[PDB]
Design a protein around this ligand. Structure first.
Ligand SMILES: O=P(O)(O)OC[C@H](O)CO
Ligand SMILES: O=P(O)(O)OC[C@H](O)CO
Ligand SMILES: [Cl-]
Ligand SMILES: [Cl-]
Lengths: 214, 214
């Protein structure tokens, strides 16, 4: 019933040659949390070939197969077995029309979009386009040791309210380190979490993740 | 002494599961042309693993390993064994400050950049940043049946002149189909070519490519 997304970003520990050995340490989970990992674009085909976990891309382009140098098309991901993507992350922000065009395309194709937003106004703006997930991550907290649930509890509540009774699930991220941060987020109405450094940069990633989702 | 770049873009025939099958049909070449292929970003780590040809990325980001969701870092490429990239293709245009920052970074790391431009004034703009290659491709001819050497011979000459006596080699592309197009491009001063549809969409890609570089 809840979702946990582990965003590997482009961290040295979980990308390139390290991707396989980093993942090797995790085991599937049964619990309240559906587990999703987000590998770097260069690692995504490798990830998809295994399929030991559910994998989402970090970013996706709406352009079809064809003359699109330097793109990562949604149709190509689908063919590789990738069933979703993060979009508009604070580190990979996009114009609004691009986002809308991509959501429109994904809605036809049973491809899941996790749309990141930086505030409640952006969250509202995108509501009518019916993203599958909204991921609230305040830009300045990302990578830090202060939880979004600690720092922005009222904004979390506002975004949840915005999406109440829609098919969109609200996730929250930035600075999530402990089980307590996760409980607090669920307590404020969120349906799950995104995490990167708290897991990827840990002395024991597998154990850190288990702390969050237990 | 010359360079030929085969840009696979995101063409169905040469991406995904088709990448390996597509490449399997080519053999190294001995001749005046150094042969480089440019696979799609999702196929790049696969391509790098093999290394039967020299492979360049279709695009590259300057950001280091770290918190850069949805990026394709130069350092990650270098660790996978990729030694260069196309940059600022007409299909993947970038702001000038991003380009400059990327060149500056590549110039420190012995990573080769093939900088695309759309006209002579843009070619001049970039001259002081010393790109390893300049690739003149007029935007409106890309994918068409009219060669850059047929349609823009004076602009080719102008760009070559701009870079004369620098360490930068000038390549040309757009609508290159025949050995004649190639001879004509070299004849106007170019040091090589970029080609996509003429090879990728051919009945016999291997023979089409051999026609160009013989
Ligand atoms: O603050 P972090 O390191 O958990 O990173 C959060 C990510 O931006 C989630 O996508
Ligand atoms: O006209 P094409 O299909 O050879 O395309 C040329 C490419 O833009 C070279 O990168
Ligand atoms: Cl790192
Ligand atoms: Cl195609």
């Amino acid at each position: 019933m809840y979702t946990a997304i582990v965003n590997l970003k482009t961290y040295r520990e979980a990308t390139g040659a390290n991707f396989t050995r980093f993942m090797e340490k995790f085991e599937p989970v049964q619990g309240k949390f559906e587990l999703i990992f987000s590998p770097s674009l260069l690692d995504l085909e490798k990830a998809a070939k295994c399929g030991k976990f559910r994998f989402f891309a970090q970013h996706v382009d709406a352009e079809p197969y064809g003359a699109y140098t330097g793109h990562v098309p949604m149709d190509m991901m689908i063919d590789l077995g990738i069933t979703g993507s993060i979009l508009n992350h604070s580190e990979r922000r996009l114009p609004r029309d691009t986002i809308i065009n991509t959501l429109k395309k994904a809605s036809k194709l049973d491809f899941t979009i996790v749309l990141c937003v930086e505030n409640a106004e952006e969250a509202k703006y995108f509501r009518e386009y019916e993203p599958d997930f909204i991921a609230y991550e305040p830009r300045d907290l990302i990578g830090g040791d202060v939880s979004v649930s600690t720092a922005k509890p009222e904004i979390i509540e506002d975004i949840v309210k915005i999406y109440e009774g829609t098919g969109t699930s609200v996730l929250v991220g930035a600075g999530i380190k402990t089980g307590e941060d996760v409980r607090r987020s669920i307590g404020l109405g969120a349906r799950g979490i995104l995490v990167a450094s708290g897991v990827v940069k840990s002395a024991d990633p597998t154990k850190s993740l288990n702390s969050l989702i237990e």
